[PDB]
Amino acid sequence: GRTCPKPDDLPFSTVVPLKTFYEPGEEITYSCKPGYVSRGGMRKFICPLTGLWPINTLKCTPRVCPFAGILENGAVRYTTFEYPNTISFSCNTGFYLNGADSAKCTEEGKWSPELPVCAPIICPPPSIPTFATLRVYKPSAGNNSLYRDTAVFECLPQHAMFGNDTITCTTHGNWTKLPECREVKCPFPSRPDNGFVNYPAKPTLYYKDKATFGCHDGYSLDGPEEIECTKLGNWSAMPSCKASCKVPVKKATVVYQGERVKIQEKFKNGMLHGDKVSFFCKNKEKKCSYTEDAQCIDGTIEVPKCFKEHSSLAFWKTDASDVKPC
Ligand SMILES: *[C@@H]1O[C@H](CO[C@@H]2O[C@@H](C)[C@@H](O)[C@@H](O)[C@@H]2O)[C@@H](O[C@@H]2O[C@H](CO)[C@@H](O[C@H]3O[C@H](CO)[C@@H](O)[C@H](O)[C@@H]3O)[C@H](O)[C@H]2NC(C)=O)[C@H](O)[C@H]1NC(C)=O
Ligand SMILES: *[C@@H]1O[C@H](CO[C@@H]2O[C@@H](C)[C@@H](O)[C@@H](O)[C@@H]2O)[C@@H](O[C@@H]2O[C@H](CO)[C@@H](O)[C@H](O)[C@H]2NC(C)=O)[C@H](O)[C@H]1NC(C)=O
Ligand SMILES: *[C@@H]1O[C@H](CO)[C@@H](O)[C@H](O)[C@H]1NC(C)=O
Ligand SMILES: *[C@@H]1O[C@H](CO)[C@@H](O)[C@H](O)[C@H]1NC(C)=O
């Protein structure tokens, strides 16, 4: 008689018992859903004779977990520290996340799992490779070293290193690949024909030992004057002495290294092996000049056939050097 209606549904709460109508004298209890609280706690109400439920002061509000916006040496992604939500973590470079990467604020107003910490990445003292020595290494964290620190070895004399010489601290707390130092010796160098070779005094020549070369008065070197033991047991290079050329004409203007020179004065003491010049030849049809090349190879140089060196006396004839380019 003059029943009460179904109670109002209010945010984040439950009503018990939930019926569609109530007799006067029946009781209902409002509770905030788990994870929410409210000033004054529950509300109980009794359906009165009027059939009208009283006013409901229920204030259902999500719990809040402790402030968690500051992760020393790292970064929290968050919207709000309220009951439904989760937050996630990362760390600045040189640091790792010691703990879980995300946390959740639970019904009990607690973070689970517990908030993490960023710790500095460190690598243990590095092992020294066989036949090596630490040239530079200073640990920045007691006996250990921090991220991106480096150390480098050098081998002992007569030993050749394979792979980069420095190692650095990875983000995973280990070091990069280590060098290998082996012993390497090469054979003796060959003395060159018409030349000499000098190298130090000992039964066996090892890595980065240096031998130097020379040539007699009419010959010059084919390669570098100095050579050394490479890491693979042979030599930098193995040069020979080749024969210079006599200048093949009496008077002619040629291109040596992009500039016109007079071959008789530029090579007054001979053309060296490998010296290349370009002679001037006359296209008759087009009344002009063009150039063909000639190179001194082991005492032999071959002037192009088209070339005609005019007599000193015959002044009328004009050298291809003086005729306009084609
Ligand atoms: C220095 O540490 C690196 C860290 O990677 C790993 O993480 C450690 C914490 C440990 O848990 C273990 O997983 C490794 O040590 C080493 O990295 C190597 O290189 C790859 C990339 O990091 C990787 O490998 C995987 O993938 C490749 C092909 O893509 C596969 O060939 C291999 O089977 C793996 O699935 C892996 O991280 C690791 N692999 C190997 C073979 O080492 C790194 O080796 C190490 N350096 C030294 C000198 O110790
Ligand atoms: C010095 O020796 C290296 C090593 O190559 C050699 O080749 C083997 C067949 C044998 O001769 C061994 O003594 C060495 O293993 C030479 O490096 C080589 O260079 C060319 C380039 O392609 C070729 O022969 C090989 O690919 C290279 N070697 C390897 C192992 O791949 C080098 O040229 C030699 N000479 C000098 C002056 O360094
Ligand atoms: C770091 O190394 C030292 C030796 O230099 C040694 O006493 C110990 O292993 C480390 N330091 C301390 C205080 O234990
Ligand atoms: C490898 O060695 C070279 C020459 O020693 C050096 O410049 C380079 O930095 C090394 N590699 C890396 C990744 O540092």
Which residue's alpha carbon is at the smallest distance from atom 7 of ligand 2?
Answer: 232
**3 state DSSP class of 222:** coil
Domain boundaries, the chain: 1-62, 63-121, 122-183, 184-243, 244-325
Say how far apart CA 274 and CA 256 lie, in whole Å: 12
Closest residue by Cα to atom 10, ligand 1, is: 172
The minimum-distance atom of ligand 1 relative to the CA of 177 is: 48
Strands across the sheet containing 150-154: 133-136, 150-154, 166-168
Query: CA-to-CA distance for 65 and 229, rounded, in angstroms?
Result: 70
3-state secondary structure of 8: coil
Per-residue CA distances from 106 to 32, 37, 38, 66, 166 (Å): 15, 13, 16, 11, 49
Rounded to the nearest whole angstrom, what is the distance from the C-alpha of residue 172 to the centroid of ligand 1? Answer: 10
Protein residues with CB under 6 Å of any ligand 1 atom: 170, 172, 174, 177
Ligand 1 centroid to Cα of residue 138, in Å, is 26
Contact 253, 264 (CB under 8 A): no
Burial 117-146 (b: 16+ CB within 10 A, else e): bbeebbbeebeebebbeeeeeebeeeebbe
Please name the method used to determine this structure.
X-ray
For the chain, what is the total number of helices (H) and then of strands (E)? 1, 31
Ligand nearest to the CA of 127: 1
| CA 230 to ligand 2: nearest atom | 38
Q: What is the resolution of this structure in A?
A: 2.9
Distance 27 CA to ligand 2 centre (A): 97
Q: Which helix (H) or strand (E) holds 264?
A: helix 263-266
Distance CA 136, CA 166 (A): 9
Closest atom, ligand 2, to C-alpha of 236: 37
Instruction: Select from 234, 238, 240 the residue to mutate for testing ligand 2; criterion: most ligand atoms less than 8 Å from CB.
Output: 234
Q: Give the separation between CA 35 and CA 109, rounded to whole angstroms.
A: 7
Under 8 Å between Cβ of 256 and 274: no
Instruction: Decide whether any atom of ligand 2 lies within 6 Å of the 234 Cβ.
Output: yes
Place of tokens 């890491």: 231
Q: Whose CA is nearest to atom 22 of ligand 1?
A: 172
The values of phi and psi at residue 322, to 5°, are -95, -5
Q: Residue 143 Cα, ligand 3 centroid: separation in angstroms? A: 7
